[PDB]
Each structure stands twice: as C-alpha cells, then as structure tokens.
Design a binder for this molecule. Structure first.
Ligand code: 0O2
Ligand code: 0O2
Lengths: 303, 302
C-alpha cells in the first residue's frame, strides 16, 4: 500500500543505493576495481563495515559461479543479496487478542518516539481498537502536557502523574485503568536521556518488573525507535537497548530526508530484530508496516 | 484498452481542461494576464485552489528559467505538470494470492458503490477468480433484495441477513463462508448515510475489528467510491473517510457527463491515495483501472 509514495520518499537514498548503482555499473566489466568502488559506495551510504563485506563477498562469489562478465548483471545479484538481508527482519506487529496488549516504547530523545506513538494510536483506532497512552517520560513537564492535549483532541485516554513521578507507578496505574476500561492496546512512552546510561536502563527494568506483577506476558512488545538520519548512531543505540532490556521490534523513522538509507541494512544484519514500521513522512500512513519486498523494489526501481 | 472510448468519455471535461487550453494559448504572449486566465480556467473546472496554485507556480517558474515567450509552448509544460500529479497516484489494485482478498467498499449513497462492486465482481469473474459479495447495507431492504437478485442472475453468491441486522455480523459470516468455499475475492458493501444517528464511522470501525478476528490482514483494501459530478463534495468525503478508517484506494465514478474533471487532480494532490479505478460509463469495461499516462494522453489529445 502507498507503494508510489514509498518510492518518492527514498529519492535521496536512491542517489547512492539501489538505482544509484546503475550509473556505476554502466558500460563496465567485472574487475576488482568495480567491487572496490562498489565497496566505497556502500560504506558512504552507511551500510556498515561488516554488512558491506558480506554483500561484497556474496556478490563476488555469486558472480563467479554464474560466469558473469558484464557489470550490469551485478544489479540483479545485488538486489537479491540486499533483499535477502531485509527479508530476515520482515515480521509485522500483531497486537490482537490481549487485554491489553502492552507496547513499551524505548529510545533516545529526538528520534521521533512520541510522533510514532501518536500515529500508531490513530492507526489502531482506525481499526476499531481502543487505545490508551501512558506518559512515562515524567520529568519532561512540557512533553507530558503536549501529550495530554493531544489525547483530548483525539479522544484517546492519557494516564499521567505530577512532574518527576516514578515512571513505574504511572505505567502501573495505566495497566490497572486499561484492564478496568477494556482497552485493547496500551502504549507507554519512556524517558530518552542516555547521559547516565545506567540510570535509564535500570529505570526500564524497574518498569518491566512492575508490569510483570500485573501480567506476566507484559510487555507484549519492547519496541525501539531509531532515526535513520543519525547513521551508525542508530546501530549503537539499538545495541544498548537490546542488551539491557531485550528488543522485540524496531521502528526506523525519517527515511525521507536523508541520503543515509543504508542504515536499515546495517541494523537488519547485525541484530536480526524484526523491523515493524518505517516512518517516511509526516502523514499517519507515513508510519508504514515494513515489508522487505516492497522496500527493495522501491529502492531498486529504475526511474 | 478502450482508449478511444476513454477519450470520448472525457469530451465534456476536455472543453475546459487539456485540449481546451489550446484556444487560451493561441496567438498569445506569456504575461501575468495569461497566468491569471489559466488560474480561473483551472478553478472553473474544479482542479482545486491549492492544486491550481502549485500548477501556476511551477508553470511560472519553469517558463522563466527556460525564457519562453510564446504562450503555445506552455501546453507541453502544463501537460507534464498535470501528468506528474496523476502519476503519484497511479498504482493498480492487485487482488491475487489471498484466500480471500477482502475489499471493504465505503462511501455515501448515490456515488456508485453498488454499481462499482457489480462491475468489479464481473471483471474478477472474467479473469477466472471466484467472487463473493456481502450485503453490509442492512437497513436498506430493497437494495439487499436487488443485490440478491443480481447474484442469482450472474451466478455470484451474496451473503445477507434480515433487515436491520448487524453489519459486522453479516461481514463476519461472509468471511467464514468465503473461506469454506475457496473464494478468491470477497467484496463488502457498507451503509452510506452521513447522518450522525447512523454512526457510520463507528460502524465502519466495528466491521474492521470483526474482520481482524478472522484474518489480521483483512481488509486487504479499504476503497472509497466518490463521484466526479459532486465537485469538492468528493474531496470533503475523502477527508472524512480517510481520517476515520484510512483509505488504501479510491474509485472515482461518473467522469462521463461532467465538465468537472479537475476533481481527479484535486483528490490526487491533497490525499496521495492511489486511484485504483475510474468510472466513465454504464458498461462493465467502463469501470477502468486508472492509468495516469493514458488519462493525460486522452485529456490532452487534439
Ligand atoms: N520527516 C519525518 N520526521 C519525523 C518522522 N517521525 C518523527 N519526526 C519528527 O521528529 C521530531 C521529534 O519527534 P518526537 O516524537 O517529539 O521525538 P522524541 O524526542 O523521540 O519524543 P519525546 O516527546 O521526547 O518522547 C519531530 O519534528 P519536530 O517536532 O522537531 O519538528 P516540527 O516542529 O517541524 O514538527 C517530528 O516531526 C518521520 O517519520 N519523518
Ligand atoms: N454515467 C455513469 N453512471 C454511473 C457510473 N457509476 C455509477 N453510475 C450510476 O450512479 C447511480 C448510483 O447507483 P448505485 O450503485 O445504487 O450507487 P450507490 O447509491 O452509491 O450504491 P448503494 O446501492 O447505496 O450501495 C446509478 O444510476 P441511478 O441510481 O440513476 O440508476 P438506478 O436507480 O435506475 O439504478 C448508477 O447507474 C458511471 O461510471 N457512469
């Protein structure tokens, strides 16, 4: 769905990756120099050191068994190698059948986490589910009020406490109120300060502990939001949160507005954590369920 | 396919748009007066305020960097500018490989929903797919009876219940019967009264929720049917349905018999929702897959 808009949103990434490789292979023979030029181009596009070597090695071996001499035929092999990486993390989120389904949202500030919560909320509401938000980012007084106003405007209940309250208590109350009110989906926001890395990770563990007192299956999803325009910073952030709490899903925002599109391959390859959604714009449908076949087609389409 | 017929069917729109711009540019120089005359002509045709101002803006910018002086050289730039709007929403519906593929048809009464469902159902049958309909407009008994009669004539199963039944229950039963009978495509009609006591948007949300208890992928398509004759009312309807349920597709009916063909440009620019089908007549093949390149060629042909 919205395939054309996904192609348009990858325009800047497509200068270097996917269809941006056609110019490199044009009128050329398969020589080590092309593989070395291909290798710079992937590294420039933020595909990542380990992921690039795997692509170059698999491409090189792949073109040898198939006796290819023309560089243009590498395009097909490159498309399937990079689709293979993304296909391993294609697994859309299913939030049905729980009372409530609890989504704990983790990430650093500025990556677009609250924006992501808002769009998910609206999308779930469009499907006939009731939704409830927990303002677990308790020390940022402004953000908490922004969120409550947004709930008012959108008829979505937002559970909150005074500034500086315990994050686990707020989220504890939200689960109580959500079970009482027959909510299908609870989404909890969290703090995004990694300045003291030990403090946030310990806070997030306290939240999960408290949640398990109420439902031993909660959180049903631990989801990370990372920003594709921060390059390898997203890779690093994913590593910290995965080790500390155990991510079950990733949302990658802002693929529009960046020539750094390779980062999706790097997070897909290093971690194998299902990528649930990609953000490609400011519309609610811009938060799209990630499908690897469509992404690869949009990226490699020959405009 | 049927390009000649698509052209004839646009003939009333072509007086103002496309080939109807040839007269405005004939023997004229590029000046503010021409751009102002072009702007009003687009507005008279229902192209839309925002969309017309994007057209006039790029078209002014493009003619300056290229240093154009003759007005009849704007025809080519205008063709391209308008074809770019429509190319962003060119994306045909593909209903293959599901068991069943579920289409949810939404829209207000009178726009052509039931006719659209009938032609789609026939076209899918011609392609060797099996089709089933759900009569989800429960309160309208005469429509429920006519759809059942249409099914018997066309050998297409129709799932219905008693007058006033729960639409979400009718839809639930149709998805179960489609699964038991290996149906490839299930098309669900819905109520179309925007009166508040009807509670249509809540009714539509309940349908989608019931669908997900049986297949979390359903509905595979949420398609709005709107009418080109309604002018901006079609844009207003698109906004109401899109905010409430989320549209994945748009069928624009009744391009024939209207000089307001600008609505297709307005809907395309404002929403970016793919236009799966265009209705240009009373025949089965007059519900056509929308292809932007052909549409622009027929609109701008001499
Ligand atoms: N282009 C694009 N932008 C996105 C996307 N997702 C989020 N953003 C932007 O990311 C910025 C930060 O969003 P938040 O959700 O507030 O970020 P977080 O800090 O993670 O949340 P927090 O509130 O701290 O929990 C906002 O821009 P500002 O509010 O700063 O700008 P503008 O003023 O122009 O709207 C969003 O518009 C996306 O998919 N595409
Ligand atoms: N010219 C043209 N007409 C179309 C097209 N699509 C639909 N129509 C007509 O628009 C009218 C709407 O018919 P319906 O399908 O009942 O529309 P909706 O009311 O939206 O469906 P609903 O039944 O409420 O779900 C019908 O004419 P009447 O109701 O007057 O006929 P008559 O009344 O004699 O049939 C159709 O023939 C089209 O592409 N081109």
């Amino acid at each position: 769905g919205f395939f054309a808009r996904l192609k348009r949103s990858l325009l800047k990434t497509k200068e270097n990756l996917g269809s941006g490789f056609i110019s490199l292979f044009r009128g050329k023979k398969i020589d080590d120099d092309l593989f070395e030029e291909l290798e710079e181009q992937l590294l420039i596009a933020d595909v990542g050191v380990e992921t690039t070597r795997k692509i170059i090695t698999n491409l090189t071996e792949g073109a040898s068994r198939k006796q290819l001499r023309d560089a243009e035929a590498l395009y097909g092999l490159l498309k399937e190698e990079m689709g293979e990486i993304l296909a391993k993390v294609d697994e859309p989120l299913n939030v049905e059948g729980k009372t409530p389904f609890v989504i704990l949202m983790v990430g650093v500030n500025g990556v677009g986490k609250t924006t992501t919560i808002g769009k998910l909320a609206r999308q779930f509401e469009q499907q006939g589910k009731s939704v409830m938000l927990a303002a677990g980012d308790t020390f940022r007084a402004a953000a908490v009020e922004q969120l409550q106003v947004w709930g008012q405007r959108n008829n979505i209940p937002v559970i909150a406490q005074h500034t500086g309250a315990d994050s686990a208590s707020v989220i504890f109350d939200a689960i109580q109120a959500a079970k009482a009110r027959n909510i299908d989906v609870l989404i909890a926001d969290t703090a995004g300060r990694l300045q003291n890395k030990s403090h946030l990770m310990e806070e997030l563990k306290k939240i999960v502990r408290v949640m398990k007192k109420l439902d031993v299956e909660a959180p049903h999803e631990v989801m990370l939001t990372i920003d594709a325009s921060t390059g390898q910073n997203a890779v690093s952030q994913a590593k910290l949160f995965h080790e500390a709490v155990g991510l079950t899903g990733i949302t990658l925002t802002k693929l529009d507005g960046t020539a750094k599109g390779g980062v999706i391959f790097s997070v897909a390859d290093q971690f194998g954590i299902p990528i649930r959604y990609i953000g490609v714009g400011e519309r609610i449908e811009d938060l799209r369920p990630f499908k690897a076949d469509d992404f690869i087609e949009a990226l490699f389409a020959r405009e």
